[PDB]
């Protein structure tokens, strides 16, 4: 059913599936900083799972295939979401409407400031590029379907990914871009995905080290263990 959708139908479907922006719990230490972020990420994961089920083609996958994709891409997905909503706030990371942080605060947690800087740089990149919401949701779904497609030790997913490419190009053509500007922008956006993968990997590397600072939920741990099981 996903492949039969038009470009507009794909966009509408993705926009409609968008998760809500959650608030943080209402003077930061290492423990307090991690507590807020962990609690927030945990609540976001539940919404992500229901968002994923609404990404066209995802439902067509076996339960195990769905688990694997989400296990691979969860932090990437949180990160691109964070960068997206931080766009209108140069120099800051909008974790929640009531939680806007600068790099200075990233220092509260060892090794986190380096990730903050990467995230801030990504946000600026999106801002420089004038990323549209319709493009954002396309990128986010791509991360979901792509990041774990090989790890699968595949045609359906690749056909869906093609569909999303068509959709991205369709959006750009509407924005009035030239054919050359279309493929250059396409490349620019997809290359940023490599950096988002990089951020996830490095962040994950730290996250499954410090499991014990604060208490992590059973779900958050199972998501983490999925990556730690290979480190």
């Amino acid at each position: 059913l996903a492949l039969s959708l038009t470009a507009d139908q794909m966009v509408s479907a993705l926009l409609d599936a968008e998760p809500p922006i959650l608030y943080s719990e209402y003077p930061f230490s290492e423990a307090s900083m991690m507590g807020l972020l962990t609690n927030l990420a945990d609540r976001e994961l539940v919404h992500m799972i229901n968002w994923a089920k609404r990404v066209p083609g995802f439902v067509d996958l076996t339960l195990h295939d769905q688990v694997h994709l989400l296990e691979c891409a969860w932090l990437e997905i949180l990160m691109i979401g964070l960068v997206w909503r931080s766009m209108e706030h140069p120099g800051k990371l909008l974790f929640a409407p009531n939680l806007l942080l600068d790099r200075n605060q990233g220092k509260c947690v060892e090794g986190m400031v380096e990730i903050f800087d990467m995230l801030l740089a990504t946000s600026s990149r999106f801002r420089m590029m004038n990323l549209q919401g319709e493009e954002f949701v396309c990128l986010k779904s791509i991360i979901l379907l792509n990041s774990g497609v090989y790890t699968f030790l595949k045609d359906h997913i690749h056909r869906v990914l093609d569909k999303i490419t068509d959709t991205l190009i369709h959006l750009m053509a509407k924005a009035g871009l030239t054919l050359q500007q279309q493929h250059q922008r396409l490349a620019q956006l997809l290359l940023i995905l490599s950096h988002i993968r990089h951020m996830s990997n490095k962040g994950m590397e730290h996250l499954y080290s410090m499991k014990n600072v604060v208490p992590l939920s059973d779900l958050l741990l199972e998501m983490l263990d999925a990556h730690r099981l290979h480190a």
Binding site: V46, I49, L63, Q66, V67, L70, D218, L219, E222, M223
Partner: peptide, 10 residues
């Protein structure tokens, strides 16, 4: 099994 096994089915 996995908590993710649930939630996905729900």
């Amino acid at each position: 099994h996995k908590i993710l096994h649930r939630l996905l089915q729900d």
